[PDB]
Write a protein that binds this ligand. Structure first.
Ligand code: MG
Ligand code: MG
Length: 252
RNA sequence: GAGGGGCACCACCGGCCCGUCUCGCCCGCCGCGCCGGGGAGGUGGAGCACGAGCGCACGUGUUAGGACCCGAAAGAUGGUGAACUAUGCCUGGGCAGGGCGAAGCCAGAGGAAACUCUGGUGGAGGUCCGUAGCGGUCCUGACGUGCAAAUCGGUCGUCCGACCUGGGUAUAGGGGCGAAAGACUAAUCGAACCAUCUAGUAGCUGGUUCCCUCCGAAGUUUCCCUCAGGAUAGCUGGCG
RNA sequence: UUUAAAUGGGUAAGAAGCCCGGCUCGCUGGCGUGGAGCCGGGGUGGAAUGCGAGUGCCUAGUGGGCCACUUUUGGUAAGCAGAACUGGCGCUGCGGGAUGAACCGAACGCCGGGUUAAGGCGCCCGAUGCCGACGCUCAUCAGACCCCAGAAAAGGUGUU
RNA sequence: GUGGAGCCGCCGCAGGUGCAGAUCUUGGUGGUAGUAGCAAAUAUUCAAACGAGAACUUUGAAGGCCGAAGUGGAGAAGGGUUCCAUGUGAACAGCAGUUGAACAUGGGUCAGUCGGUCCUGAGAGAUGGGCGAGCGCCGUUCCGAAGGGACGGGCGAUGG
RNA sequence: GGCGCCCUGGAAUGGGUUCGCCCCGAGAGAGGGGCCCGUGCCUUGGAAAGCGUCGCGGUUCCGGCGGCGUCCGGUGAGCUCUCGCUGGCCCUUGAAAAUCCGGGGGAGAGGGUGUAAAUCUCGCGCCGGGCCGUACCCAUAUCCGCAGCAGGUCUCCAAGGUGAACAGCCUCUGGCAUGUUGGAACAAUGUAGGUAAGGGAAGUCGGCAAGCCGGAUCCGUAACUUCGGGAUAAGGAUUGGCUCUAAGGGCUGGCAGCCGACUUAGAACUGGUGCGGACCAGGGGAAUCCGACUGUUUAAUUAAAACAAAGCAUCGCGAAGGCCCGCGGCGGGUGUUGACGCGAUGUGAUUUCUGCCCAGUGCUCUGAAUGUCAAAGUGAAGAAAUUCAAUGAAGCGCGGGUAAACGGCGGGAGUAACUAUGACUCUCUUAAGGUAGCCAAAUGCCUCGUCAUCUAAUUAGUGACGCGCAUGAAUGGAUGAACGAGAUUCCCACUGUCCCUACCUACUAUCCAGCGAAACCACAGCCAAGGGAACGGGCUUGGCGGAAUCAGCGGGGAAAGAAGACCCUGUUGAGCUUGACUCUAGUCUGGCACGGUGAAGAGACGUUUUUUCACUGACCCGGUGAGGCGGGGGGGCGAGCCCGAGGGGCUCUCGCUUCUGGCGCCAAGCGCCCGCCCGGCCGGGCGCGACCCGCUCCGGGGACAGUGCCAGGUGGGGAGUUUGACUGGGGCGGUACACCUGUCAAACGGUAACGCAGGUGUCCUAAGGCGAGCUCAGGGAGGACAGAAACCUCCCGUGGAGCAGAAGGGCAAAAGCUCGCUUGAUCUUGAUUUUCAGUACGAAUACAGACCGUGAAAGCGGGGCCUCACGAUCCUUCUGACCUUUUGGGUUUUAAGCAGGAGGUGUCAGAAAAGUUACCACAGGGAUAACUGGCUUGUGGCGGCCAAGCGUUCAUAGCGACGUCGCUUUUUGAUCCUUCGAUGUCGGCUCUUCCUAUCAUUGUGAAGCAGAAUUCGCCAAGCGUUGGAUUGUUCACCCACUAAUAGGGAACGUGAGCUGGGUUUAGACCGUCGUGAGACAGGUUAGUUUUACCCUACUGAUGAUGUGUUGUUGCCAUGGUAAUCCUGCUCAGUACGAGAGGAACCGCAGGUUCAGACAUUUGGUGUAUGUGCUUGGCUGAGGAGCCAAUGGGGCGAAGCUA
């Protein structure tokens, strides 16, 4: 009769994110006349750190084309960049590390981070620490290019989508063990109120579909349908298969 | 002695009206018909057979209403609470002394070399002993109409850490929050508290207030989701 | 089960009966047959005992019962479970059974005299304080009054 | 006998119509009973003074405790006059009280520079807009003609 | 003090440096500067004030008057605070704004000169600064807890000694009156603190509780190991006081001379072997089970093995997405996000492994493969309502995948040269048959398994074994260091836990002065038996019965607390669960709308359907301060291109920013035009620089998504409700729940029980109807095969056969067999019977009016030879009349009626219905279980009577079959009387009494009694009937001692006497069971045990009545009563006896248990606080003392005491 734990994460009372000491959205600068037709020069000032993100950031000062003003962007730091480096951003930008330029002009098989899934959306895909995407298959008629996401799933996107050349810094992070319960606590204190996950088998029949019984057992099959209602989707939600995995994934 | 007329009422026979049923023939014409009416028998009706009702008052019985009085566990509607406590977040404050001695470093010694050994230095750790703090194992100690609607005395757990804590702030009742004990949410929690619906319902417990006179029971029948209850016949009293 | 009680159950013991003559009928049919109904007429003393009866309306409470002879079912048995007939208790005091729900007598307005019932009469405690009758019995565990509240098989050259 | 201003009989009428009980309701009073009790944190003593009156007030003297993570010195929240003086001893302080945070009368809190005031934090909340039968809610940059100001530069009027 | 500041100059034989590091050709060292903090000192303030001290005036303001002083040094791992310098740790990076300031730019502005402007963050001077808070407490008395409440409640400041220390103990500054009272006494019982001879767990469920060990220095340390640990392992040695010695630093001079720190080591002397002297402070070892650890957890009964955790897996998702919120919006959260991410689960570090199953239940994927399946739409028939038909969404069904999804892992056959088992082979159920491992496990019923080992003795522990009721692999299996306020077993050490208690101390209790309640209370308060609601205080019969009281005490008041939490009932609830009943949010699909423009393709019959592409304008999503969009031309250094002459433009290109941590705006210039200069000077204006036109701001989707509405899926996520009755309590079982036969049943009828013996929910077109002819079961005697049984014949044959089935009744030219016809098993109205209320249904009887059958006819027949074989209202369906009504009147369809058949209610006079609760709640019930008590005694026990036997012989010394009669209430039942507004439920411990059915002790009788020893009876309950191991045990079983180790009762004596082990709440684990919540006298673990001050009883203490008062000395009525058992020597190795063996009485020495006392002796105790020893502190030191809640410790009188 009582609501379950994942149902209470949608109201967002204590399950809202911890966003105070974060710096801002890490977004490419918006497209205008300079990047549709040419390039523009910017210099990165400092490599900073977000709490709760695994990647670092790069704050880059550009020269405003229309007002006399220097205005600061925040980029996802591509790996290998340093402070006091010139960063070039445009259609006619030259393909180096850290330069951001449209995916339709760059060749096939170049490694891409922080790319747009619809044009002008200022960077959505392939942004976690150490991740990247690969471009193949330019279709210069009905201009669409297909990329390869970090999940191995390919996606045909628009050609004028914009993207910084390189891989996201801070990679190899998940190779280290958390190694004790204390350093997992500090990990999620930067992120959310989510960390000590009680098993639903351990709680009571008000609190979960799996709890109860004189023995800790699930009882009911732990693969459930996708059109199950809220408060019943717990466990392996619309699982195509179970058991320890064989092969690679063998389902497109 | 006998005879006669017989009230009311009771029993019986006969008749009458309405519905139906069988059997049968006749009659009438604001128009001759897939019309109207009648007969003789048997049956169904809360009927007729020279009317008794109405209004008013009182008494008894039963029913619907708070319904002889008091009593739930509930359900619903609309509100008030995070001054305790649960968890986030904001901004502050707090934690003696010792023990072990990681990485780094320095010298010396062995050795043909590869390298090894030794002594320092160094001070790491959800590291150990252990104050303040935070807890609350054992005595199954004291207290148990207590100092106290949970306290005390030893003893004990942990004290750089998932640490302890103040004020600010957020989340609210089939909701919240929960390192999960159905824990905690103002001494209230396997669904809070306030007011209303509400005098909710009870075949179930308790109670039910003056005197004398007369009569005086039953615990059995049949039916019931009936078995601690009713209805029905018996038993009773009252009126005639 | 041939036979077959006791106890028991129905019915009859009159005028609403008995008899005679006549009329109706569409029933019955050799028949003025049969049977029903109907009218008129003739004569009342028809077992014992006891009692005044008939009928209608309204109607409360009750719908857990229990007990004892007798007869019975289940049970080793039960102050057990379940029936039959009658009485009682519940609703009921009183005399007695010391005691008591139900045993035995007897049912009850308020009192005086008398007499009894069941039970009794050494003393509690009313009444044997009779010159009561005949026998039986000795217990180092005597006996002592329906229900009823304690005993059996077996044995004694104990006594009759 | 107390009491000090109303009351009753009869014939009809009408009821919030008579108590011993409901772990009844409210109020009062017992017995228990001058009883249980006034036992956590080492401790009091002598003299004096004022007074009707002193184990407890004050003052001196001795002896002790706390022992600087204090029984010491100041604050925050909270309280609200509890602070201070004099008077009082009815009640209250669970013995007493000549004492008090009690009662009675009268005093006391002074700021440019101590804080509030100001700023924003998590967050809270209008307007535009949206939703909604509606009280209203969502929402905080989102679907908004969201600047009322100006170093300036010039015209036009207008004034010392 | 700091500097990641400068200049000179260049370093290697590398140097400078720190406690550590670190720094250097990107400039070290060295030399000379610069800057920042200066909270320190000097000075102004400022000595005039402050304080200390010595005076002197002033009665009263006096912030009186005056003298002198307020001075030199040292030191430090010191404490506290501040400033700084450098490191480390982070999958953790540790706030915003208000304000304030520097810098860059240079639009402007300024006096224009032999004088002063604009300006000034410089030095002084003037004016103003409103509003509100401001006392005090801040806590064992100002706050919260009902209060002056051992509780709670945020901070800062903090001295001397001892010492590692903000420890403990002692003192100074500053506080206080011992915590809401004083006095006297020093009994019990308590609470808190000690101590104890000898023994050392013998106590106990358990070593619970207490005690040991404890600091530091010097040695010395194992198994095991994840190599880090363990580890303060373990095990030793030492420690004082006093003298000394040796070592450990600073600064001044040209290697020496003057001052400072408390450490370390070594030796001597010394004391009654005493030294961490108080204080502070690790008991250790060997093992097993569980959890890796640290963490966390039910505030107020559980701290754990639970939860969490790192690690390991699996799952969903590329944003119009996934998972959630929301009454609502394209509203919110994850998301200031983007697969190294978010969301959803499970297992639980490491190491080592992860077996076999896709049948089931889920989950998931697919081909115009196909079964089923809604609205809308399509077609047909009809006058229409309406009806039918075909087509076919998702889902289901079918097929595939998936077990680190829920989960499951059994049998049965054959098979090896003793037997056994089965490597092997073959199959069933149901897909597979439990692999590696592991085990009587926290998982094994039987079971206290068997076997080793530990003990004198072990239901314990450990190690094995393993067809294992019911082990098993992320339900995770097995190991394994470290760590557990976890569970358990042993060993050492230690001890009053125990033998077995004793004594001392504080605080009480006790008495007094003051002050003073509450629970509770029908009336009350001495018993034995009887009866009684079966356990009286009162009642009956007995015993008996003096005031008034005090300190105790726990037998009784079935003592108080509470309308039993168990159990049952209720047509009372609630929490959860699901393959319950009924729905619901949500979501997946189809339709119609919003919803437009075009093209192409396809399926079926111009008609209809469907698909894919293109468009954009609705609609939607991004982005932006809606900042350059689309077409068109300006420019060749680029193409000079189809050809080629000076060039032409089928086809064309874009542009001006890319070695570097710099700057970039507010227009230059050119052309025109005005007022201003007489063909020249000021101040303004416009354009080109900066192309033109145009209808979305730019991109991305787009007639889809989305939304409104309806139809169908799915939907315990959520809501509502339900969960039969009877019942020797309930459940399970059964159906005695509707019905029929025989009996019970007691000779009319009626009659109960979960009484007995059975039966029914059908069967039958003949097994209904009628007529005719016939005789059955069985037997005898004959007949080819032919027999017990074949068919044929004759005789006998009263029902011994048959009649559909259960019984009972009935029946012979029959009610049975065979045959011939038939449909009366049809239509219709009443009455009667049965059950019964004298209602209904069902069944039946007698008719009547029809139409029929059969028979020659009489007749018989409206179901079955009779007794059973079945079913309301409402609804539905069919039939019946040339019927009645269909609402203003007609016609027609339909609908409603009337009449009677059917489609059901078996809980059968008829609801529509799954669990669980140990998290539980209410109303009740002793109408009703679990406990005692009561009736009963089957059963358990203990006895007799008879005598076939046994006993060499010999029934009865001792036994005794086949029987048979009893007792007892210590067994277990049976029953259900008392108790449900409560009688506290096992065992042990402690303690008193009682019984006898006698184990021992006294006196005896009988043996198959030689003696010794046994055995069986008698009077007899006087007196005894132990110490232990395992176990919660009662019970058991074993070791040992003994005269003997007999059995019982007292509300299964005894919880205001205890304990809490067991059982029996709530947490948790395992096994089996269930889909699940949950269940299991199956196992394991952790789990609040309240009150006497009342009345009596008992125990002690005053006293009361009576004697005139009072005293001394006495008597005894009555009541209590207490002693017991063994051993040794003697008798004696004698009697007796073949021997072996082997008595007793008298006497004598002790002892055991028990009872009464006592302190000479010896132990304990000890606060004579007696005496000296001693640690830290304190009084200036000595001397003498004091404090440390009794500072410790050695001896100790008296007194108590074994
Ligand atoms: Mg978890
Ligand atoms: Mg009689």
């Amino acid at each position: 009769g009582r609501v379950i734990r994942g149902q209470r994460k949608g109201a967002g009372s204590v399950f809202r994110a911890h966003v105070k000491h974060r710096k801002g959205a890490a977004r490419l600068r918006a497209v205008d006349f300079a990047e549709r037709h040419g390039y523009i020069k910017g210099i990165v000032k400092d490599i900073i750190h977000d709490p709760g993100r695994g990647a670092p950031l790069a704050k880059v000062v550009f020269r405003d084309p229309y007002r006399f003003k220097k205005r600061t962007e925040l980029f996802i730091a591509a790996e290998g960049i340093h402070t006091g480096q010139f960063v070039y951003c445009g259609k006619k930008a030259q393909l180096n590390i850290g330069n951001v330029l449209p995916v339709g002009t760059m060749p096939e098989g170049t490694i891409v981070c922080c790319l747009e899934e619809k044009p002008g959306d200022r960077g959505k895909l392939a942004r976690a620490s150490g991740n990247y995407a690969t471009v193949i298959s330019h279709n210069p008629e009905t201009k669409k290019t297909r990329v390869k996401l970090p999940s191995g799933s390919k996606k045909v996107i628009s050609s004028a989508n914009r993207a910084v050349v390189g891989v996201v810094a801070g990679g190899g992070r998940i190779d280290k063990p958390i190694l004790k319960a204390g350093r997992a606590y500090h990990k999620y204190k930067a992120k959310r109120n989510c960390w000590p996950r009680v098993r639903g088998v351990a709680m009571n029949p008000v609190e979960h579909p799996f709890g109860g019984g004189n023995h800790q057992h699930i009882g009911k099959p732990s693969t459930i349908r996708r059109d199950a209602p809220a408060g019943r989707k717990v466990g392996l939600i619309a699982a195509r298969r179970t058991g320890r995995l064989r092969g690679t994934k063998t389902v497109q």
